[PDB]
Amino acid sequence: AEVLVVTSKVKKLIKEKGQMNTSAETIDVLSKAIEQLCLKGVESAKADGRKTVMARDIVIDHL
Amino acid sequence: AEVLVVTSKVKKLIKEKGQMNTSAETIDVLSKAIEQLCLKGVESAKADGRKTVMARDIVIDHL
């Protein structure tokens, strides 16, 4: 339900830049990661009293 | 170049579940996060001598 990454372009990146295939579960993990980053972004934006999720609401520095 | 998240479905999630709009830069951050997670997955898979990026190669526990 609701794949949130562009599967074809992820597979293309991983193949072209890394010489690797991409498992189905890899796509699932990436999609779930996007969902969590979005929900956490909602939490951050609302806590600031805003109505728009902004780049500063997507905390990805631990990457 | 190469947006790696499904922009329409991200905006739909953020609006429907959080009542928020989604800025253009939010989409950019999410896309760059996916790119980094994929490249790091390539590093992990190759270090294990494999030819396929697997779910265990996408380290997202810091979420």
Contact B39 A62 (CB under 8 A): no
Cβ atoms of A54 and A42 within 8 Å: the answer is: no
Rg from Cα positions in chain B: 14
CA B63, distance to chain mean position in Å, is 12
Pick from A17, A38, A46 the residue to mutate for testing the B interface (most B CBs within 10 Å): A38
Query: Tell me, what amino acid is at A45?
Result: A
**CA-to-CA distance for B42 and A11, rounded, in angstroms?**
11
Two structure tokens written together for B9: 């479905």
**CA-to-CA distance for B35 and B43, rounded, in angstroms?**
13
Two structure tokens written together for A39: 């929900």
Q: Which SS3 state, helix, strand or coil, does residue A32 take?
A: helix
Contact A63 B36 (CB under 8 A): yes
Two structure tokens written together for A34: 């996007």
- DSSP 8-state class, residue A52: E
Resolution (Å units)? 1.8
B21's enclosing H/E stretch is strand B21-22
